[PDB]
Scaffold this motif. Structure first.
Motif, PDB file in Angstrom:
ATOM      1  N   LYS A 111       0.822  -1.206   0.000  1.00 48.14           N
ATOM      2  CA  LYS A 111       0.000   0.000   0.000  1.00 48.14           C
ATOM      3  C   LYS A 111       0.858   1.260   0.000  1.00 48.14           C
ATOM      4  O   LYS A 111       0.565   2.218  -0.724  1.00 48.14           O
ATOM      5  CB  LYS A 111      -0.949  -0.008   1.199  1.00 48.14           C
ATOM      6  N   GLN A 112       1.919   1.281   0.801  1.00 46.54           N
ATOM      7  CA  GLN A 112       2.796   2.443   0.840  1.00 46.54           C
ATOM      8  C   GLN A 112       3.632   2.521  -0.432  1.00 46.54           C
ATOM      9  O   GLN A 112       4.058   1.500  -0.978  1.00 46.54           O
ATOM     10  CB  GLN A 112       3.706   2.385   2.067  1.00 46.54           C
ATOM     11  N   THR A 113       3.864   3.743  -0.904  1.00 45.64           N
ATOM     12  CA  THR A 113       4.629   3.982  -2.124  1.00 45.64           C
ATOM     13  C   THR A 113       5.785   4.928  -1.819  1.00 45.64           C
ATOM     14  O   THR A 113       5.547   6.038  -1.313  1.00 45.64           O
ATOM     15  CB  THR A 113       3.737   4.562  -3.229  1.00 45.64           C
ATOM     16  N   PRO A 114       7.048   4.550  -2.083  1.00 48.49           N
ATOM     17  CA  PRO A 114       7.468   3.248  -2.614  1.00 48.49           C
ATOM     18  C   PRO A 114       7.307   2.143  -1.581  1.00 48.49           C
ATOM     19  O   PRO A 114       7.433   2.407  -0.386  1.00 48.49           O
ATOM     20  CB  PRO A 114       8.942   3.468  -2.961  1.00 48.49           C
ATOM     21  N   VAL A 115       7.027   0.920  -2.033  1.00 51.88           N
ATOM     22  CA  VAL A 115       6.788  -0.173  -1.096  1.00 51.88           C
ATOM     23  C   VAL A 115       8.031  -0.421  -0.250  1.00 51.88           C
ATOM     24  O   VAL A 115       7.950  -0.576   0.975  1.00 51.88           O
ATOM     25  CB  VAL A 115       6.338  -1.439  -1.847  1.00 51.88           C
ATOM     26  N   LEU A 116       9.196  -0.452  -0.884  1.00 50.28           N
ATOM     27  CA  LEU A 116      10.451  -0.486  -0.140  1.00 50.28           C
ATOM     28  C   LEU A 116      10.842   0.930   0.266  1.00 50.28           C
ATOM     29  O   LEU A 116      10.881   1.821  -0.589  1.00 50.28           O
ATOM     30  CB  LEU A 116      11.563  -1.108  -0.975  1.00 50.28           C
ATOM     31  N   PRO A 117      11.136   1.182   1.538  1.00 52.50           N
ATOM     32  CA  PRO A 117      11.512   2.535   1.951  1.00 52.50           C
ATOM     33  C   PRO A 117      12.719   3.020   1.171  1.00 52.50           C
ATOM     34  O   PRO A 117      13.666   2.253   0.943  1.00 52.50           O
ATOM     35  CB  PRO A 117      11.834   2.378   3.446  1.00 52.50           C
ATOM     36  N   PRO A 118      12.728   4.285   0.743  1.00 48.40           N
ATOM     37  CA  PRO A 118      13.845   4.755  -0.090  1.00 48.40           C
ATOM     38  C   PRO A 118      15.198   4.633   0.583  1.00 48.40           C
ATOM     39  O   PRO A 118      16.192   4.347  -0.096  1.00 48.40           O
ATOM     40  CB  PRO A 118      13.482   6.220  -0.369  1.00 48.40           C
ATOM     41  N   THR A 119      15.273   4.842   1.898  1.00 51.96           N
ATOM     42  CA  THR A 119      16.564   4.797   2.575  1.00 51.96           C
ATOM     43  C   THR A 119      17.188   3.410   2.484  1.00 51.96           C
ATOM     44  O   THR A 119      18.395   3.278   2.253  1.00 51.96           O
ATOM     45  CB  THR A 119      16.406   5.217   4.035  1.00 51.96           C
ATOM     46  N   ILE A 120      16.384   2.363   2.669  1.00 51.56           N
ATOM     47  CA  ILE A 120      16.912   1.003   2.599  1.00 51.56           C
ATOM     48  C   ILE A 120      17.409   0.701   1.192  1.00 51.56           C
ATOM     49  O   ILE A 120      18.508   0.168   1.001  1.00 51.56           O
ATOM     50  CB  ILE A 120      15.846  -0.012   3.048  1.00 51.56           C
ATOM     51  N   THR A 121      16.604   1.038   0.182  1.00 49.15           N
ATOM     52  CA  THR A 121      17.022   0.809  -1.196  1.00 49.15           C
ATOM     53  C   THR A 121      18.254   1.636  -1.536  1.00 49.15           C
ATOM     54  O   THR A 121      19.185   1.141  -2.182  1.00 49.15           O
ATOM     55  CB  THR A 121      15.880   1.140  -2.157  1.00 49.15           C
ATOM     56  N   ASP A 122      18.277   2.901  -1.112  1.00 44.34           N
ATOM     57  CA  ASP A 122      19.431   3.748  -1.389  1.00 44.34           C
ATOM     58  C   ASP A 122      20.675   3.237  -0.677  1.00 44.34           C
ATOM     59  O   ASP A 122      21.734   3.084  -1.294  1.00 44.34           O
ATOM     60  CB  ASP A 122      19.133   5.187  -0.973  1.00 44.34           C
TER      61      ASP A 122
END
Ligand code: ADP
Ligand code: BEF
Ligand code: MG
Lengths: 15, 289, 66, 605
Positions: free
Chosen positions: B209-220
DNA sequence: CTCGCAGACAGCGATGCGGAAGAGA
DNA sequence: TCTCTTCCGCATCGCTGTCTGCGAG
């Protein structure tokens, strides 16, 4: 209406 | 039909279990060598079980459709080399989508879980869902914590590649995406984009439901950890200095550019670096004068 | 002259770290033969592998373990 | 204690899996750690139960983690829970059962509450209990007998040894019940403090007070709320409820001024009754119903001035019905903890937001003040709009080659000055101040290093506050920053990292820091954590920038000091570069300026 | 022999106190 | 000639990091 700065709004990572 | 999908998933999973260092996995010399010659495994010692190559780890993190397709493509390429005509097997795959070689091809397909006769290898065969060509379970937190609702050892093994497993529960596994774990995965051969994609596809419905589904900090942060390893871009080359002939230096520069050997150049200092492959050619050109 | 080795491209801050290693002879020899640019440097190929871990150790010092 | 192949704690021979585990949101491992699903339907009830029995370890948005400890369970029994109630509810919520180890562990940490009591009456300390057996057992212990002054049974003890008495009593599994029955104490006259009707407490403030005042008696303990949540009103409301002489201990002369303002704002006590005890000035502390002071003033060890000594004599020879200890995390210090024995207080109410320290003395608060009465959730207040939504960011400022040339070589403690005065970091700070000032934002720039604080402040021509600045001068700076439109950004030092109430401070920039202090990072972020006037819950009202220098020890410290905030659910975005810096007239744009700065930094040593 | 504690020392900065010096009467 | 306010050292203390002995397999 005082939108957030670009660096905060979107990632600045090259990847 | 309902049992076919379970059969295909189980048969493909055991192959994946064998890929990782799982003691409990299907044993098959033909499959083991088939993976070894598929470019994603290497043994170097028949007695000892083979290890996982750099491309092996990348293959594991791929989605099942792409994961299966890559193996099939490698199988087709090796079919001609081993003596099996590609056209004969290719036609069979097309028929599935809609002889001794066919029997050998069918047996290998059954080992992959794509087909199942169910009647002690009768003439009739029932292709599975994967023969023609899933909800997520991982919750990613902002503190580099993964909570994977998994019962299978394979998914735990895949997540354990790029993270530290902290706790294990039947319907949950606590893991932490530390830099050391990610850096170790990157060194093994994995790439950050694969890790984010692996987590993205296997994303818990709560995260969708949340966008982005993966939190940006973790992906970054995962990307930054990957970028950390390649801070220095080593490139073999041959350096030329003491360019007394300043006028001819540009001529040599143009000659290097035309040949495509030039890698880096500094006009202010009158120097350039060329790969050793073209080092002889430029040396011959200079000798010609 | 003609020199054979490896070209290293890195940030200006990282370049200063490499030059500091060269001057201090921390690796037992002057691995830099000719500085190329504020972003690029040329080093002897025989010590690139040992140099790589030296940078990695610097990265570990400037990072926290969790 | 079984370990999987991947260094993981295998806990399946330990506990089974329940049938309807989907509805149950709780995992309870034999290690004592509890994992809660924040997305479950019954999350609210589980969260309230867990925070009472287990102190949180990390609370991201989706899955929280709690840890079961002896102190946490001792806090659960204090608020009213029983071992049967705790184990029953935990088993009901647990989706895998409660392992036998945890079941007995909970029982052990609950049969020790209420056995022994500490009562202060007529300036004398007595250890009272209704069970002579436990009292005799305490007497058998040598140190307990050592600190003795030289049916219900009570033996008097000496004031100077209360801390040793309390510490040992914890070790003996007989914690002292420091509960004040203010409603049944006519010895101390009631004060005229009253909570005026205009004060309407927030739901978490009411809940925290309910835990403190669950029964008729007033429980002594620590109430933890996010910075800017309104801990002052909880302290004022606690004083209003107790209605006895109240002693408030702030962190600095600015804090006591704010505390005095809060009492006047939220209570009907007249200004004549409120008194301050600080070096700058005192409002006749000899006669005062509410006394506001600082740890430094009361905790001073060297001989005091005559004016201050007279106040200390009055404070020592007094009984206080409520001692509010603001910034409790500093109490476990060697001399600050002495303040507790100096002042005879019935109920000690601890107020803090970051119950963390870089040492292991934080647990001392259990036997110094009391159990953690309450601990609110930062995200829940964030979403509810009670505190500002802060977009934590970590700005990476590439280290200048000439500065880095020196940093890689120099190691004789000169690095801190070298990478703090990074020309790139200064330019990033200068650009951020310029950008946000144009947005009518109020900026607070924090610099632990005074040399960097002055360097940035004069160079940017902004007011700065730090040690030497007088109380009046810094209070004037805060007033201008709050009200003066011209003053939009101020520079602050270690002095103002706590207790500085700046409601309209939208932005906070951190250029220097003291090690990997999680407390300092979280406390500093608290300045811009107050609810804004026209705030919207989901609009990122406030911003927090932590300027760091790449390829430097500050990067290691930056991650260390972010540990507490991430445990609260805060995500620190990484900003490798800032757009628009090139087109901005920032200083240190030439190698000549940078070279001059490096020489000055090296000279400063 | 190797590996991990662990309280003390050091750095910084901040605070209370005293003393000397300047402005006001 | 006295009194109040400003400013500069002494001494101490809080917080954190880093270290040289001590202790454990
Ligand atoms: N219930 C309330 N109603 C109105 N304003 C409140 C309430 N609680 C707190 N505030 C305001 O919020 C701020 C809280 O400041 P303070 O008590 O110093 O916060 P903390 O001690 O939690 O850091 C003040 O501006 C205070 O007036
Ligand atoms: F926690 Be607050 F800033 F006093
Ligand atoms: Mg406060």
């Amino acid at each position: 209406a005082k939108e957030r700065p670009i660096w905060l709004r979107e990632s600045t990572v090259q990847g | 039909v309902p049992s076919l999908d379970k059969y295909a998933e189980e048969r493909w999973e055991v192959v994946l279990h064998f890929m990782v260092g799982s003691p409990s996995a299907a044993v098959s010399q033909d499959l083991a060598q088939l993976l070894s010659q598929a470019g994603l495994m290497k043994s170097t010692e028949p007695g000892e079980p083979p290890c996982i190559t750099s491309a092996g780890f990348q293959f594991l993190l791929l989605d099942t459709p792409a994961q299966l397709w890559y193996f099939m493509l490698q199988y087709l390429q090796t079919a001609q080399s081993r003596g099996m005509d590609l056209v004969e097997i290719l036609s069979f795959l097309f028929q599935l989508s809609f002889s001794d070689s066919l029997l050998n091809f069918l047996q290998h397909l059954r080992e992959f879980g794509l087909v199942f006769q169910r009647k002690r290898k009768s003439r009739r065969y029932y292709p599975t869902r994967l023969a023609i060509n899933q909800p997520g379970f991982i919750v990613v937190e902002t503190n580099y914590r993964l909570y994977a609702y998994t019962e299978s050892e394979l998914q735990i093994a895949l997540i354990a590649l790029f993270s530290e497993m902290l706790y294990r529960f039947p319907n949950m596994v606590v893991a932490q995406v530390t830099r050391e774990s990610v850096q170790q995965a990157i060194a093994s051969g994995i790439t950050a984009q694969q890790i984010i994609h692996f987590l993205r596809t296997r994303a818990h419905p709560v995260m969708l439901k949340q966008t982005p589904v993966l939190p940006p900090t973790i992906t970054d942060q995962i990307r930054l950890w990957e970028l950390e390893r390649d801070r220095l871009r080593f490139t073999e080359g041959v350096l030329y200095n003491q360019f007394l002939s300043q006028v001819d230096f540009e001529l040599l520069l143009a000659h290097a550019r035309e040949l495509g050997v030039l890698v880096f150049e500094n006009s202010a200092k009158r120097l350039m670096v060329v790969t050793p492959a073209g080092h002889s050619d430029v040396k011959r050109f200079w000798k010609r004068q | 002259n003609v020199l054979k080795g490896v070209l290293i491209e890195c940030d200006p801050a990282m370049k200063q770290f490499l030059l500091y290693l060269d001057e201090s002879n921390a690796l037992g020899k002057k691995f830099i033969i000719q500085d190329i640019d504020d972003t690029h440097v040329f080093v002897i190929a025989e010590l690139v592998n040992v140099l790589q871990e030296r940078v990695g150790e610097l990265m570990d010092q400037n990072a926290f373990s969790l | 204690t079984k370990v999987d192949e991947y260094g993981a704690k295998d806990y399946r021979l330990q506990m089974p899996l329940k049938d309807d585990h989907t509805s149950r949101p709780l995992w309870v491992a034999p290690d004592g750690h509890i994992f809660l699903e924040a997305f479950s339907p019954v999350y609210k009830y589980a969260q309230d139960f867990l925070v009472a029995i287990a102190e949180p370890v990390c609370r991201p948005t989706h899955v929280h983690e709690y840890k079961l400890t002896a102190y946490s369970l001792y806090a659960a029994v204090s608020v009213g829970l029983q071992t049967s109630d705790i184990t029953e509810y935990l088993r009901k919520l647990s989706k895998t059962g409660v392992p036998d180890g945890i079941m007995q562990f909970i029982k052990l940490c609950t049969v020790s509450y209420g056995k022994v009591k500490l009562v202060l009456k007529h300036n004398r300390y007595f250890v009272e209990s209704c069970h002579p057996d436990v009292i005799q057992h305490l007497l058998q212990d040598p140190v307990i007998r050592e600190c003795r002054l030289r049916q219900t049974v009570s033996f008097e003890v000496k004031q100077e040894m209360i801390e040793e008495l309390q510490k040992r009593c914890i070790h003996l599994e007989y914690p002292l019940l420091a509960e004040y029955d203010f409603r049944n104490d006519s010895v101390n006259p009631d004060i005229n403090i009253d909570l005026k009707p205009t004060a309407v407490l927030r739901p978490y403030q009411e809940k925290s007070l309910r835990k403190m005042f669950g029964n008729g008696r007033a429980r002594s303990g620590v109430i933890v709320l996010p910075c800017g949540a309104g801990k002052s009103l909880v302290g004022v409301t606690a004083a209003c409820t107790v209605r006895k002489r109240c002693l408030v201990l702030g962190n600095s002369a600015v804090s006591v001024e704010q505390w005095k303002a809060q009492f006047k704002m939220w209570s009907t006590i007249d200004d004549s009754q409120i008194c301050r005890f600080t070096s700058d000035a005192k409002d006749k502390p000899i006669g005062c119903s509410v006394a506001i002071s600082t740890y430094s003033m009361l905790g001073h060890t060297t001989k005091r001035s005559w004016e201050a000594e007279r106040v200390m004599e009055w404070l020592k020879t007094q009984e206080w019905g409520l001692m509010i200890l603001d910034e409790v995390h500093t109490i476990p210090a060697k001399m600050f903890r002495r303040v507790l024995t100096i002042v005879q207080a019935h109920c000690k109410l601890g107020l803090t937001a970051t119950l963390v320290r870089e040492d292991d003395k934080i647990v001392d608060l259990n036997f110094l003040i009391g159990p953690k009465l309450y601990e609110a959730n930062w995200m829940e207040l964030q979403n509810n709009g009670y505190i500002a939504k802060v977009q934590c960011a970590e700005v990476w400022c590439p280290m200048s080659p000439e500065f880095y040339r020196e940093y890689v070589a120099i190691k004789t403690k000169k690095r801190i000055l070298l990478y703090t005065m990074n020309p790139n970091k200064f330019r990033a700070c200068q650009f951020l101040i310029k950008f946000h000032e144009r947005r009518n934002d109020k900026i607070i720039v924090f610099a632990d290093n005074v040399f960097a604080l002055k360097e940035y402040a004069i160079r940017l021509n902004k007011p700065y506050i730090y040690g030497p600045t007088s109380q009046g001068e810094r209070m004037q700076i805060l007033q201008n920053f709050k009200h003066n439109p011209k003053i939009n950004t101020i520079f602050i030092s270690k002095v103002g990292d706590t207790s500085f109430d700046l409601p309209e401070a939208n932005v906070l920039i951190q250029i220097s820091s003291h090690g990997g202090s999680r407390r300092q990072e979280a406390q500093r972020l608290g300045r811009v954590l107050r609810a804004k006037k026209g705030m919207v819950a989901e609009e990122y009202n406030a911003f927090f920038y932590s300027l760091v220098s790449q390829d430097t020890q500050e990067m290691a410290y930056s991650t260390k000091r972010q540990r507490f905030l991430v445990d609260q659910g805060y995500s620190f975005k990484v900003i490798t570069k800032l757009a628009g810096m090139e087109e901005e007239d920032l200083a240190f744009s030439t190698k000549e300026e940078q070279q001059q700065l490096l020489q000055k930094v090296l000279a400063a040593t």
